[PDB]
Design a protein around this ligand. Structure first.
Ligand SMILES: O=c1cc[nH]c(=O)[nH]1
Ligand code: SF4
Length: 210
């Protein structure tokens, strides 16, 4: 069967503060139990560009805000190269509770890919955030966020660098699917620098869309 997920837990408000506090009470999937807190979005409803990642990392889970670690610094590098003010954005994630595993002698917490069940469970919060902010443009950072709004069969590589519209997205924002900043953290340097430049292209396009 198709799950209710977080729908039981989303209060009937468009206020981003009330939603974030309510999200700390969510039991829409299993991820609230081990995590410290919900990591809701950052920014205000006046934003015209919304950005969506995959899930919190270790430091996100401690801070309670998205993109505060290494991936967030690289994101800030990309936004600066695209002439975008981070505080003019609404930045969030498809999944709001840190999914992780502990380990014998490892890093304290190691992030684990959310399952599609968890992504669909958490999606009502994303819908609430888009209803709250009414973005004109939505940047989808990486495969998980893209599939969160475009469906489980969406392939980012098939649509890189296109401005899309979908039928189920509230307010009918333009959509730009692109690379996740964490992807620029490892790999061959050449590929990483060209990918960073491509991210910058997708951001400049997004900041230009009307
Ligand atoms: O906030 C964050 C941090 C790491 N990876 C994501 O997708 N979002
Ligand atoms: S992850 Fe999303 S759905 Fe699962 S419990 Fe936390 S908020 Fe609710």
């Amino acid at each position: 069967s198709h799950m209710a997920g977080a729908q039981d837990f989303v209060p009937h408000t468009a206020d981003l503060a009330e939603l974030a506090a309510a999200a700390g009470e969510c039991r829409g999937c299993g991820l609230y139990r081990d995590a410290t807190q919900a990591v809701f979005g950052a920014g205000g409803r006046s934003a015209r560009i919304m950005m969506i990642g995959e899930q919190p990392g270790d430091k996100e889970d401690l801070a309670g805000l998205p993109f505060v670690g290494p991936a967030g610094r690289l994101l800030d590098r990309a936004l600066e190269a695209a002439d975008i003010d981070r505080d003019a954005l609404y930045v969030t994630n498809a999944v709001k509770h840190f999914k992780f595993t502990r380990a014998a002698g490892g890093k304290r917490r190691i992030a684990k890919t959310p399952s599609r069940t968890e992504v669909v469970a958490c999606r009502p919060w994303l819908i609430a955030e888009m209803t709250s902010v009414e973005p004109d443009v939505v940047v989808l950072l990486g495969a998980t966020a893209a599939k969160a709004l475009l469906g489980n069969d969406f392939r980012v590589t098939q649509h890189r660098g296109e401005v899309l519209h979908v039928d189920d997205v509230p307010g009918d924002p333009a959509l730009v699917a692109t690379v996740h900043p964490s992807s620029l953290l490892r790999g061959p340097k050449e590929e990483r620098e060209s990918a960073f430049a491509g991210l910058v292209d997708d951001l400049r396009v997004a900041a230009d869309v009307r």
